[PDB]
Amino acid sequence: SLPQSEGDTNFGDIGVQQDKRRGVTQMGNTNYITEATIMRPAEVGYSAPYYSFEASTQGPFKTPIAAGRGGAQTDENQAADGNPRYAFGRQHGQKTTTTGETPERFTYIAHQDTGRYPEGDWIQNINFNLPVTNDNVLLPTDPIGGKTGINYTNIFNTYGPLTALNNVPPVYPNGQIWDKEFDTDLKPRLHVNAP
Amino acid sequence: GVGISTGTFNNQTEFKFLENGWVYITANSSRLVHLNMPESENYRRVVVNNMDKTAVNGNMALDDIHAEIVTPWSLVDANAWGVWFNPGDWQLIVNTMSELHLVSFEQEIFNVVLKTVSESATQPPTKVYNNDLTASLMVALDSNNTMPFTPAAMRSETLGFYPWKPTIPTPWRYYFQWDRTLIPSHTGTSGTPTNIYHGTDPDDVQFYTIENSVPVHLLRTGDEFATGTFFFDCKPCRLTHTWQTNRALGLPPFLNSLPQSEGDTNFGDIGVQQDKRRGVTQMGNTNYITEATIMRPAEVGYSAPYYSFEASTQGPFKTPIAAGRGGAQTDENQAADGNPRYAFGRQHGQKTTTTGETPERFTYIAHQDTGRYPEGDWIQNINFNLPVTNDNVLLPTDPIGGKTGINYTNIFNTYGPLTALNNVPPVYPNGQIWDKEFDTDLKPRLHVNAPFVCQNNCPGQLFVKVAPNLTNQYDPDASANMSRIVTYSDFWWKGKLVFKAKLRASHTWNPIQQMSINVDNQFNYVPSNIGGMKIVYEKSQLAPRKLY
Amino acid sequence: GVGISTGTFNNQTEFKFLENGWVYITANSSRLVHLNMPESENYRRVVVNNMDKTAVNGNMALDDIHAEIVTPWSLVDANAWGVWFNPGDWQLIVNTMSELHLVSFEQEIFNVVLKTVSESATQPPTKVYNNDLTASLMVALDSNNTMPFTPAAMRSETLGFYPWKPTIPTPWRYYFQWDRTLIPSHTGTSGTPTNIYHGTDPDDVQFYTIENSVPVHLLRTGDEFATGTFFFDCKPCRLTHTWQTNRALGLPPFLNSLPQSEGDTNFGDIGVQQDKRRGVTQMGNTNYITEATIMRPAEVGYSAPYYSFEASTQGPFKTPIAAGRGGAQTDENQAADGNPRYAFGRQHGQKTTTTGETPERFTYIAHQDTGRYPEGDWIQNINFNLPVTNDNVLLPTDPIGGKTGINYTNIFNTYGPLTALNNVPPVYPNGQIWDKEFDTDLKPRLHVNAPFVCQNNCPGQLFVKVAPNLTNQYDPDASANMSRIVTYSDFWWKGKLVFKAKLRASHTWNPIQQMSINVDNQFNYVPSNIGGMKIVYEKSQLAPRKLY
Amino acid sequence: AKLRASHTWNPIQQMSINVDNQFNYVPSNIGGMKIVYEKSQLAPRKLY
Amino acid sequence: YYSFEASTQGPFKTPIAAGRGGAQTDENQAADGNPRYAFGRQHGQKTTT
Amino acid sequence: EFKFLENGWVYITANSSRLVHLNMPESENYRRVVVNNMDKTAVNGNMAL
Ligand SMILES: [Ca+2]
Ligand SMILES: [Ca+2]
Ligand SMILES: [Ca+2]
């Protein structure tokens, strides 16, 4: 069913009951073929725990994120995607005739959409059965560990054998250009500081 | 050239046995395709918005909104196993070969025909079909792959599966960028969540046209189009399955006590206190060497969150799983392993003499044991100390987030540097055969939709369309869409797909599993008294192989 | 040959990067053209006389009378930017290249088709279109340019601008000598001025016929017509703009006093009495060296009379202006600079789904500053003596001839041996590309309608027409026009236009202007949900360059 | 590096000076400079 | 850590590939998965035991 | 400098030169120094600092 009147408010329509469609799905116990349900080759981007500090022999440190920008800019969650922030001054970009020791800074937001919008996630019981019942859904709104400010998305990780992502983009003019590689037996697939 | 054929119909499968147990398999397939003129000659930018469904709290998963560009072209897709092999060939391959290689592909179009419909509006009124020997069929072959890749198998819109039944192509259309936000909720949820379609981001707009990017060929009745041969560059696909799980790797414990009476109820016995055994373990604070505790080289398979939907710039989507079948079939958890389900009909497997729009379907369960049985998992405090106390165990029975229906296994992930898994197995006949690879800097280790992923370039798509057949009165300056003579085309399609396989040999004293006809399935491979056919799905990797 | 194609549809734009930053741009464009038989098979000598409009004193400018010869032939014209490039290509050229060269051109006609209309006058009554495999399309290519040059872009009757929308040619007709007199007047004017059409002068009569001066080709369905390649001989066109006016040429005055506080409101100061400075001036009777007084090498741009109509043998006509845009856009005086205005529709840019006969239009404003701002001019007595006294200044505010609405700037002209100006810039997509040169002894230094003027010969025009399809009864001796079978033709047109351009490099610390899509224009480059298209005009010379 | 070519009917995103940013690429009357950050990957490409 | 997963033939421990992050006195050998070796007489244990 | 070669391949050469100013070291020896801002982290909830 196609639109007969100009205007992006005049929508088209698939025109076939969701449970009577044809196609492939990775949900063996239902007949619903939805745009959120139908099968896709693999997965673009991944979910990582945010504002996570891990510890080892010399103290705590933040857990790095390699992510694009999945989410309409106005909305985002720069923590979830790990956007870099740069502080500098006088000799590297800040207005030359400025005074005082307060640096200049900016948070770089990439164009590539390989990020995530946590508030959009959710997990549900395999019986499916919609509309889902409160007891069969874990929302980025339900508390974890009793804490009112902690999600599951907060410690969630969806990296796996089907994960596809892109390298980091150049950042003019404060970005580093090249970088030495770690001398470990197994190397990282990328670095977050230089392309 | 109106009066002579330009081709030969061929639907034979040839097996060429070479030296060293290597087989050359040539799959010829040809079909009669029927094509109607486009409803419109323009490209349309259309948005779908079923907010009525998702406006009901707890229906997030039924989200269908997206934007697409509707083109006046049709896609001729033959990427599905059923197009090339019949159940007879599949049995020969699956029971005999041990691995399969995808070599080359090529298609051709011949004996084109264009008729015109004359509406003898009178008496009944009648219709008349006449040949239009000057009309043209338009053919475009996107060899550089400029256009977006849209594999019809995904929506079961591939070429039919019967050499003697005419078929058709599918209208071509592709995705167009849009920005969408949908906040999750459940039945109890109060108020209205947030369900917004923001629109389109300028930096992501890509409007593609076949006219501007591909050379179009005009074929008349005496014309014919051929493609050269295309050689694939993919990894071989194995037709064998592994059965060992972490529990069956290595040297079993020596039994100091053996059974003296036949009967699988008369057990043997290791005969050594669990805390006085020798061997290696990765649990530094205990002396228990158990079959669940002893060390294994690495890990077969992994745990992933199930019925997990993640969100990004254009709405939510399910988190894919690449898993075998760990768990006695009767028990399983197809959600946990992500078994695929296929819905299709009449032209691709569903009983031909059926009626109604309800499709046919099945959930494919693999033979390889690389899956998980969640209800079997559990986590415990490092002090160990058995029997474990309720406060030192997290069971797939204890609730998370207060929710009574959510586990930890539900959001659990055990993928890491020690993870070993296998690729996806073929799925006859509804499966897709090959797939293009993502153009990202870091690629996936596999795809869940097809066994063969083109490392180089995949074969470009073939688009076909009926050129406009105008009447005496046409006016370029006319908002209201013009008039054309009703025209349609019929042409024969022919393709050749070549694989290369390797013959198997016996290695165990016992027989192996094999596909076979029998009293029960017998009638799923023959026509009915009315001529009704159907193509039941089969499995590809019967036949074990060691893992370690 | 009725059953096979004679061509390939191609509408790809190819960019071939050669050594030294030189690009080879090949523009392929092809279209489906629809053609109807002529209303008449004879040449008509027709006169147009709208004396009813000009009979009203003060309407001189609405004069439409002329004489033309109406021919039974049609003109296939493709001389307009929109025919060859889409907005995507134009952005690449305009943002990257620094100059453009016109190299060669060639066309072809293939897959000709001739149908016949059968009037099934009954019931509805119905119509029937049948192929007439023996009918012929007539093709004439005026290679020696015997015929008058009539560029269809002038009246927006060029080939359409969309690869997927069928198009049409325009009926051909040309001017025929006539003598006309029209005396100017205004509303107050008493009596009737003098509005006469004297007729035709014998020494200027030129009746042209295609049959007598060009070889005509007869094409049937299996036929095809091709042109050789034609190589242009024109000057290169620059894709850059100058911004310096006489006021920004040379060494600025040294400032003895500089600003000590940031802010463009904190000015610097030359610091030297205006009558005690050093430098050169062209005002022998004063010692004032001002920025408006100091000498400059020559003069950029010139002043011309505006809304000036001159008259000769066949009536009045506007006086052309070749000028840039001198004057902050908000202020301007588009009359003074002669900005062009373009009206067109549906087939050449106006929204495709629009209705009604009102065209779409725009006034092109160039980037180059070679224009004038009249209100800024003034003339003064040589004694100088400031502040100038009212009796020694003529302002664009003092009336001339007693008229309160007429200036001196209005009839002013400052063109001379020191005048420097630039050629006209491309205008996408409605602009004409090339133009034939006047065959006078002394040529113009430029044309205001196209950037490329053929110095040698331009490519001759291509005329097409449906040969007469007679019925059983035809009588040569019949005043009343005979009878023909209703016949029409449809054929594919294909052309290739090759340019040669040069890639730009950065030279200033700051970024330059560039064409870009954005939230606001985004939807002017994509189809609507109904399939409506439109092609918005763009500018060609963004990117400055020094003048001196 | 490798030069790009057009492939879609519509224009693509491009960096450009304008009334608003104009003065971030020029000195002040006092000679003050600054270097504002820019983005590098404007211009889409298909993923699949 | 101290995670047992299950499949077709019963539960099994989830392996860890890790060094020793943490001042030895403190550690969490479970978290890093340090291996433990038990043997005797013929492979290291005091021969006269 | 931008050098356009055949096949749309560009050779970009970036020359950069600067005047560098250098003062003598405060000390001619190597020092092994420890930084300890326990005053900040001694406040519960400031781990990240
Ligand atoms: Ca984006
Ligand atoms: Ca098994
Ligand atoms: Ca300017």
Distance separating alpha carbons of residues C497 and C232, to the nearest angstrom: 11
Burial class (CB in 10 A: 0-12, 13-18, 19+), B179: buried
Centroid of ligand 1 to alpha carbon of B292 (angstroms): 48
Q: Identity (one letter) of the amino acid at C5?
A: S
CB neighbours of residue B213 within 10 Å: 19
Spatial CB neighbours of B22, under 8 Å, sequence gap ≥ 6: B500, B501, B502, B503
Backbone angles phi, psi at B150, to 5 degrees: -130, 80
F vs B contact (3+ beta-carbon pairs below 8 A): no
Cα separation of C429 and C424, whole Å?
Answer: 15
CB B194 within 8 A of CB B181: yes
Asked if B540 and B426 count as a contact pair (C-beta separation under 8 A), the reply is yes
Does D touch E (3+ CB pairs < 8 Å)?
no
Residue C209 in contact with residue C73, Cβ under 8 Å?
A: no
Distance B543 CA to ligand 2 centre (A): 10
Q: Rounded to whole angstroms, how far apart are CA atoms B506 and C212?
A: 90
Q: With contacts defined as CB-CB under 8 Å, which chain A residues touch E21?
A: 55-57
Q: Contact at 8 Å (CB) between B220 and B133?
A: yes
Residues in Cβ contact with B507 at an 8 Å cutoff, skipping those fewer than 6 apart: none
Residue A153, phi-psi category: left (phi > 0), alpha (psi -120 to 50), beta (remainder): alpha
A180 to each of A1, A65, A167, A192, B332, how far by Cα in Å?
57, 19, 16, 12, 47
Which residue in chain B has the smallest CA separation from C488?
Answer: B472
Taken in order C150, C151, C155, C156, the sign of the CA dihedral is positive
Cβ of A97 and C262 within 8 Å? yes
> What is d(CA B465, CA B488) in angstroms, rounded to the nearest whole number?
10
Q: Which residue of E has its CA nearest to A59?
A: E22
Enumerate the β-bridge partners of residue C498. C26, C104
* Token representation of residue C366: 């160039």
Instruction: Give how far the C-alpha of residue C314 lies from the chain's centroid of Cα atoms, to the nearest Å.
Output: 23
- B72 CA distance to ligand 2 centroid (A)? 48
Please name the residue ranges forming H helices in B146-266.
Answer: 210-213
Q: Which of D34, D37, D38 sits opposite A95 (nearest CB)?
A: D34
Closest of B217, B458, B412 to residue B301, by C-alpha: B412
Which residues contact residue C337 at a Cβ distance below 8 angstroms, ignoring those fewer than 6 apart? C321, C323, C324, C325, C326, C327, C371, C372
Nearest Cα residue to B344 out of E32, E4, A33, A145: A33
**Under 8 Å between Cβ of D47 and A40:** no
Residues contacting B118, CB < 8 A, separation 6+: B127, B128, B129, B130, C128
* Buried/exposed code over C128-140 (b: 16+ C-beta within 10 A; e: otherwise): ebebbeebbbbbb
Bridge partners (DSSP) of residue A53 are: A62
CA A158 to each of CA A46, A155, B413, B448: distance values in angstroms, whole numbers, following the listed order: 5, 10, 7, 16
B15 phi and psi angles, rounded to 5 deg: -115, 120
Rounded to the nearest angstrom, the minimum Cα separation between B218 and chain C is: 6
> Buried (b) or exposed (e) across B511-547, using 16+ Cβ within 10 A?
eeeebeeeeeeeeeeeeeeeeebbbebbbbbbbbbeb
At residue C248's C-alpha, the angle toward residues C242 and C251, to 5°, is 125
Residues B326 and C208: their CA atoms lie apart, in Å, by 90
The helix or strand, by DSSP H or E, that contains position C276, with its residue range, turns out to be none
Q: How many CB pairs under 8 A join A and D?
A: 42
Q: Which residues of C are annotated as a binding site for Mg(2+)?
A: 144
Experimental method of this PDB entry? X-ray
Of D7, D42, D48, the CB nearest to B146: D7
CA distance C201 to B322: 90
**Tokens encoding C400:** 């001339």
CA-based end-to-end distance of chain F: 45
- Give the pair of three-digit tokens for residue B111: 């004996």
DSSP assignment of C220-239: -TT--EE---EE-----EE-
Q: Tell me the sheet residues that pair with B140.
A: B216, B463
Q: Do E23 and A57 touch (CB under 8 A)?
A: yes
Contact between chains at D32 and A173 (C-beta distance less than 8 A) = no
User: What counts of helices (H) and strands (E) characterise chain F?
Assistant: 1, 2
All residues at 6 or more sequence positions from F27 whose CB lies less than 8 Å from its CB, including other chains: none
Residues of A in contact with F47 (CB under 8 A): 53, 60
Given a contact cutoff of 8 angstroms between Cβ atoms, the answer to whether A34 and B65 are in contact is: no
Ligand 1: distance of its center to the CA of A82 in Å? 16
Q: Which two tokens stand for residue B325?
A: 């079948």
Q: Which of D8, D42, D48 sits opposite B206 (nearest CB)?
A: D8
Which residue, chain included where needed, has tokens 């930890």?
B408
CB B32 within 8 A of CB B14: no
- Residue given tokens 């392996």 in the structure block: E15
Nearest to residue B465, comparing CAs of B484, B443, B442, B451? B484
Assign B403 to helix, strand or coil: strand
For B242, residues 6+ apart whose C-beta sits below 8 A from its C-beta are B300, B368, B369, B370, B422, B544, B545, B546, B547
Q: Is A110 on the interface with B (CB under 8 A)?
A: no
Q: Looking at the complex, does the CB of residue D9 fall below 8 Å from at least one CB of chain C?
A: yes
State how far the alpha carbon of C298 is from the alpha carbons of B44, C243, C282, C417, in Å. Answer: 56, 16, 12, 9
Q: After which residues, if any, is chain F broken (C to N > 2.5 Å)?
A: none
SS3 C206: coil
- Nearest chain A residue to D46, by CA: A112
**Could you tell me the two tokens for C133?**
């495999």
Q: Which of A25, D11, C236, C410 is nearest to B202 (CA)?
A: D11
- Residues of D with Cβ-Cβ distance to C261 under 8 angstroms: 30
Interface test with B, best of A112, A159, A162, A165 (most B CBs within 10 A): A162
Question: To which residue do tokens 């969309």 refer?
Answer: C162
Beta bridge mates, A59: A56
Q: Where is A80: in which H helix or E strand? A: helix A78-81
User: Are the C-beta atoms of residues C413 and C303 closer than 8 Å to each other?
Assistant: yes
The reply to whether B179 touches chain A by the CB within 8 Å rule is yes
Which residues on adjacent β-strands are paired with residue C46? Answer: C68
User: How many CB atoms are located within 10 Å of the residue C511 CB?
Assistant: 16
Distance from CA of C526 to the nearest CA of A (A): 12
Q: CB neighbours of B263 closer than 8 A, spacing ≥ 6?
A: none
Q: Chain C neighbours among A 71-100 (CB < 8 Å)? A: 97
Distance (Å, whole) CA C458 – CA B34:
48
In chain D, the N- to C-terminal Cα span, in Å, equals 24
Decide if B314 contacts B178 (C-beta within 8 A). Answer: yes
Contacts of residue B43, defined as CB under 8 A and 6 or more positions apart, other chains included, come to B69, B70, B71, B72, B207, B209, C164, C527, C531
Q: Read out DSSP for B348-382? A: SSS-TT--SS--EEEE---SS-----GGG-EEE-T
D17/C512 CB distance under 8 A: yes
Residue spans per domain, chain B? 1-548
What secondary structure, in 3-state letters, does B99-135 show? EEEEEEEEEEEEEEEEEEEECCCCCCCCCEEEECCCC
- Rounded Cα distance between C332 and C339, Å, is 10
CA–centroid distance, C413 to ligand 3, in Å, is 23
> Cβ distance C111 to C1 under 8 Å?
no
Q: What is the resolution of this structure in A?
A: 3.0
CB contact under 8 A, C529 and A8: yes
Question: Is B208 touching D (CB cutoff 8 A)?
Answer: yes
By the 8 A CB rule, do C490 and C32 touch?
yes
Indicate the SS3 state at residue C422. Answer: coil
Rounded-to-integer distance, Cα C8 and Cα C387, Å: 75
Neighbours of F7 (CB within 10 A): 11
B468 upstream amide cis, omega within 30 of 0:
no
Of D7, D42, D47, the CB nearest to B203: D42
Taking a C-beta distance cutoff of 8 angstroms, is the pair C423, C446 a contact?
yes
- Who among B179, B307, B447 is closest to A41 (CB)? B447
| Rounded distance between C-alpha atoms, residue C497 and residue C452, angstroms | 13
Q: Annotated binding residue at B410? A: no
Helices H / strands E in chain C, number of each: 5, 31
How is residue C354 written in tokens?
Answer: 């629009």
What's the 3-state SS for A3-37? CCCCCCCCCECCCCCHHHCCEEECCCCCCCCCCCC
Can you name the CATH fold of B1-548? Answer: Empty Capsid Viral Protein 2 (2.170.30)
Q: C-alpha angle E13/E17/E18, rounded to 5°?
A: 120
Nearest to C5 among B218, B474, B477 (CB): B218
Phi-psi region of E25 (alpha: psi -120 to 50; beta: other; left: phi over 0): left
